[PDB]
C-alpha cells in the first residue's frame, strides 16, 4: 500500500512559499499554514481537516448562508422547547409506591375507579391529547410504534389484567352480580386486555402540530386483589363503565364488584412492567420531541426509544432522568439534542420541573465514538449509517435567555466545536459571564464561533477567544461591510466601510486574521490580495 501511494503521489520538498497563487500568512508562529491549507478548508470543509487544525488552534469561521440558516433553525427550535415547560410523568395516574417490594400503584377502590376513569379519556380526547401547540400522550397509556409520521397510524402495547376463576351461582340484578361462591384471581388462565375494551382510534390521526411528548410506555400486567369495602353500590355512574365493558367482553373471566356474601370490589392494583421498546418511524418533516421525566427507576429502566432516520430535521429534549435511546441514520439527517435539562440542577417543586443554576464539569468528558455518544449521564446509540463523513450532530444549551451555546459534534471524526448566538451588543455586554458559564460547564475549546440571524434577515459572523477574551464580528449592513474588534468591553477597532471581497476571518491562538481582496482606486484590473 505504501509502495502504491508513493508511486502515485508526488512530493515537492524544495523551499517555496506559494505555488498555487494564494494570499499567504506565514507569520503565525513561523508556520506555512497560510491559505495553502485554508483554501482546501474553505472550499469543501473536510471534517478531518477541521479536527486536525483544531490541534493547531485555527478556527476558520463559515459565512455560508446554509450554515447560517441551519444555526438559526437550531436556535429557534431550542428556544421554543426551552420556553414551554411540562410536568413529571405520573401526576394523573402513576408514581406507584414500593410496599414490600411489589410496586403497589393504587391502594383503594375509588383510586382504582379513578385510574380507569383516567384511562377512559382515550375514547374522548383520542390516544394523543393536544395543547395549544403540542401533541401530548395521556398518562399511563402505552403506544408501541408511532408509525404515524409516515402512514398516519399508531400501535398499542399490552396493558392486560389477571383473569378470574369460576364462580358457583351467578345472577345479575341492577347491574350488580350476586354470587354464591366468590371467584378467585388466577395467575394462570392467561391475561385479559383492556385495550380491546377501549376502542382507540389508531388508524387516522392528525399531526398538524410538530412538537410531541414521548410516552411513558412499558408493557405491564396488573396484579390485583379483592377486599370487602362495603360502601359503594351507586358508584356505577362513573368511569366504571370501562370496568363493566371488560366484564362484558370477557364473560366469566373478570368481575370487578360482586355480592357473594358481602360486598366486594377491586382494592389494589400491582403492575409488572415488562420490557418495551418503541420503534418510532420518522418522515420528511421537521418533528420535535420532548423526552418525559419519570421519577421511578423501576419504570424508567424498562424503556427504550428507537427513532428512525428519514430525511428531515429532528430534535429531542433530553431529560435529567435517563432513557435508553437508539438512533437510526441515513444520508441526509439533522439531529438536534437539547441538553438544557442535563446541564442544570433539576428539582420537582409542585410536580413540574424547575431548573437550577448549572452543573460543574458535566460536559468536560464527552465520549464521542463512531456509533455512541455519551454526555452527562446519558448514552445515545447510533446505528444504520454510522460511516458517513458529512453529517453533524448538534447539542444545544441555553446559557441565558438570549445567548445560546451550540456544540457541533461529528461522530466519525470524534470532534466537537462551539458556536454562539444572540444579540451582538448583549453578547459583548455579557461576554465575561458567558465565558464564566462555559468554564463552569468545563469545555476546553479555546476559540468559539458566533453565527447570528437577527430580525429582517441580516446575518452576523463572529469569533470569540476564551483566553484574554478577544472578539471579531463582521457583518453586512446597508450593502456595506462593517468590521468590529472588541477587547471584551470596548470597541477597539471599527471600520464602518470595509471595501473587500471574499472576506475570511480566522484566529490562531489570540491572533485574529482577516483576508480578502482589494481594488486599487476602484479599478477591477488592479486587484491586490491582503492578509
Amino acid at each position, epitope marked *: 500500500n505504501l509502495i502504491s501511494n508513493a508511486v502515485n503521489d508526488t512530493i515537492n520538498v524544495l523551499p517555496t512559499i506559494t505555488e498555487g497563487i494564494p494570499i499567504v500568512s506565514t507569520i503565525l508562529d513561523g508556520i506555512n499554514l497560510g491559505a495553502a491549507i485554508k483554501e482546501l478548508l474553505d472550499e469543501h470543509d473536510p471534517l478531518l481537516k477541521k479536527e486536525l487544525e483544531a490541534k493547531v488552534g485555527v478556527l476558520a469561521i463559515n459565512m455560508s448562508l446554509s450554515i447560517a440558516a441551519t444555526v438559526a433553525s437550531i436556535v429557534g427550535i431550542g428556544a421554543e422547547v426551552t420556553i414551554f415547560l411540562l410536568p413529571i410523568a405520573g401526576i394523573s395516574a402513576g408514581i406507584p409506591s414500593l410496599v414490600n417490594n411489589e410496586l403497589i400503584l393504587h391502594d383503594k377502590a375509588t383510586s382504582v375507579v379513578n385510574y380507569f376513569n383516567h384511562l377512559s379519556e382515550s375514547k374522548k380526547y383520542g390516544p394523543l391529547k393536544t395543547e395549544d401547540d403540542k401533541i401530548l400522550v395521556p398518562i399511563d397509556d402505552l403506544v408501541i410504534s408511532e408509525i404515524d409520521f409516515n402512514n398516519n397510524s399508531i400501535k398499542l402495547g399490552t396493558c392486560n389484567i389477571l383473569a378470574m376463576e369460576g364462580g358457583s351461582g351467578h345472577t345479575v340484578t341492577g347491574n350488580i352480580d350476586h354470587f354464591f361462591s366468590s371467584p378467585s384471581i388466577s395467575s394462570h388462565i392467561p391475561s385479559l386486555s383492556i385495550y380491546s375494551a377501549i376502542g382507540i382510534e389508531t388508524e387516522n390521526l392528525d399531526f398538524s402540530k410538530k412538537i410531541m411528548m414521548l410516552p411513558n410506555a412499558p408493557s405491564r400486567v396488573f396484579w390485583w386483589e379483592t377486599g370487602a369495602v362495603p360502601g359503594l353500590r*351507586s358508584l356505577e*355512574n362513573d368511569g366504571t*363503565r370501562l370496568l363493566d*365493558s371488560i366484564r*362484558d367482553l370477557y364473560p366469566g373471566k373478570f368481575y370487578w364488584r360482586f355480592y357473594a356474601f358481602f360486598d366486594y370490589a377491586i382494592t389494589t392494583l400491582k403492575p409488572v412492567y415488562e420490557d418495551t421498546n418503541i420503534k418510532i418511524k420518522l418522515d420528511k418533516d421537521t418533528r420535535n420531541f420532548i423526552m418525559p421525566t419519570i421519577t421511578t427507576n423501576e419504570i424508567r429502566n424498562k424503556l427504550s426509544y428507537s427513532f428512525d432516520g428519514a430525511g428531515g430535521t429532528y430534535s429531542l429534549l433530553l431529560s435529567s432522568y435517563p432513557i435508553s435511546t437508539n438512533i437510526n441514520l441515513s444520508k441526509d439527517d439533522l439531529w438536534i439534542f437539547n441538553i438544557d435539562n442535563e446541564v442544570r440542577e433539576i428539582s420537582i417543586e409542585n410536580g413540574t420541573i424547575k431548573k437550577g443554576k448549572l452543573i460543574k464539569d458535566v460536559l468536560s468528558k464527552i465520549d464521542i465514538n463512531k456509533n455512541k455518544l455519551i454526555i452527562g449521564n446519558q448514552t445515545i446509540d447510533f446505528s444504520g449509517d454510522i460511516d458517513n463523513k458529512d453529517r453533524y450532530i448538534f447539542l444545544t444549551c441555553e446559557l441565558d435567555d438570549k445567548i445560546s451555546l451550540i456544540i457541533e459534534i461529528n461522530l466519525v471524526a470524534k470532534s466537537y466545536s462551539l458556536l454562539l448566538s444572540g444579540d451582538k451588543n448583549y453578547l459583548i455586554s455579557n461576554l465575561s459571564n458567558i465565558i464564566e458559564k462555559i468554564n463552569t460547564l468545563g469545555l476546553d475549546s479555546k476559540n468559539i464561533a458566533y453565527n447570528y440571524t437577527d430580525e429582517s434577515n441580516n446575518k452576523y459572523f463572529g469569533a470569540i477567544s476564551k483566553t484574554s477574551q478577544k472578539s471579531i464580528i463582521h457583518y453586512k449592513k446597508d450593502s456595506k461591510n462593517i468590521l468590529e474588534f472588541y477587547n471584551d468591553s470596548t470597541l477597539e477597532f471599527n471600520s464602518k466601510d470595509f471595501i473587500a471581497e471574499d472576506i475570511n476571518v480566522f484566529m490562531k491562538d489570540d491572533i485574529n486574521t482577516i483576508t480578502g481582496k482589494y481594488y486599487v482606486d476602484n479599478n477591477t484590473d488592479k486587484s491586490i490580495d491582503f492578509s
Partner: antibody
Amino acid sequence: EVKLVESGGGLVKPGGSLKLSCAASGFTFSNYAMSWVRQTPEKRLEWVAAINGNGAKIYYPDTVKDRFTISRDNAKNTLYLQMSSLRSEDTALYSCARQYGFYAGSPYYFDYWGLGTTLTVSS
Amino acid sequence: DIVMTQSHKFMSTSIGDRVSITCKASQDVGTAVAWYQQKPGQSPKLLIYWASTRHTGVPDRFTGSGSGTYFTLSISNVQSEDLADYFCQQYSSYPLTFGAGTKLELKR
C-alpha cells in the same frame, strides 16, 4: 370532518317495509356505538334501537321487539335500520347518532347527530 | 319504561338575563343526564354530559347542575345565538327517555 349522511326517504303503504342507511366518514368505524332516533313533530324524541361496536348486542324497547332491526356492515361504513309493520305511527324524522360506547353497548349521550330522513306513512 | 318530565314547554326571556331550565326524573338516575340544544332545521348539539361538565367548544355560560331527580341547566347571559330548544335525557337505563322540550324565546 366528521359527517353522518343518510339516504332512506320515501313514502310507503302502512303494513309495509323499508330499509334505511347511514354512511359515516372522518372517524374510524367499529369503535363507536351507533343508534337510531325518531324525532316526532308532535311528541318528544323517541330512541328506537341501538347497537354496539362490533354488532354483538342490540337493544330495543317493548314497542320495537320483533318489529325493527339493525344490521351494521363495518367494511363499507354503513348503518341500516330495516322496518316492518308501520302502523301509521312512525311518521318522524329519522336521524343517525354516534354514542360514546366502549365495547358492550351501554346507555350514553350522543356526540354527533345526523341531519334527518323525513319518513312519513299514510294512505 | 322510565319516564322523564320537563317543566315548561315554552318560555321567553330578554338578552342579558339568566334562564334555568329544570328537568325532573321519575326515579333516581344519579348524575347520568345530558343536555342538548337543537337549532331549527339543524341537528342537535350536545352541551352538558354527566350533568356537571360541558362539551368541547360549548361556551362558558352553559353551566349544569343537579344530582338525583332534579337537574337544572343555567345560562349566565342569554344572547341571540342562545335561543333554541333544550333537551334532557337520562342514560342510566336501556330505554332512554328524552325530555319534552323547552324553547327559549325572545321577549319583544
